[PDB]
Swiss-Prot record:
Portion held of the full protein: 1 to 118 of 151
Protein name per Swiss-Prot or TrEMBL: Trivalent organoarsenical cleaving enzyme
Domain notes: The thiolates of the vicinal cysteine pair (Cys95-Cys96) directly coordinate the arsenic atom of the organoarsenical substrate.
Organism: Thermomonospora curvata (strain ATCC 19995 / DSM 43183 / JCM 3096 / KCTC 9072 / NBRC 15933 / NCIMB 10081 / Henssen B9)
Miscellaneous section: Organoarsenicals are used as herbicides, pesticides, antimicrobial growth promoters, and chemical warfare agents. Arsenic is the most widespread environmental toxin and is classified as a Group 1 human carcinogen.
Positions annotated to bind roxarsone (III): 62
Keywords: Dioxygenase, Iron, Metal-binding, Oxidoreductase
Outcome (variant: residue 36 to F): Retains less than 5% of wild-type catalytic activity
Amino acid sequence: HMSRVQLALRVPDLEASIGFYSKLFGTGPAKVRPGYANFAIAEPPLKLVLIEGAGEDATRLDHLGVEVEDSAQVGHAARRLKESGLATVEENQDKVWVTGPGGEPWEVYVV
Ligand code: NI
């Protein structure tokens, strides 16, 4: 209906995490690859991405994002974000990246 947040977690155990999230949100993954899984959750509106970690023992934040409706929304956000003094990097618009002050990366992207 509108844009949704994208939470990408680096997880130590991809299979265990798929099963927990399937129970948390009541649905199975939309896509499953080696080392990668994703969920398109309708309520709460969310794109949850699970990325299999290499070394560490605990789940960490990999990146955050805002999944918008069409490519045109990406360009609108890109223009909005720049007029604000935020340093943006565009991929070609299909994706814009900005980084928060503590280093957390955000992508605004069309799916
Ligand atoms: Ni992503």
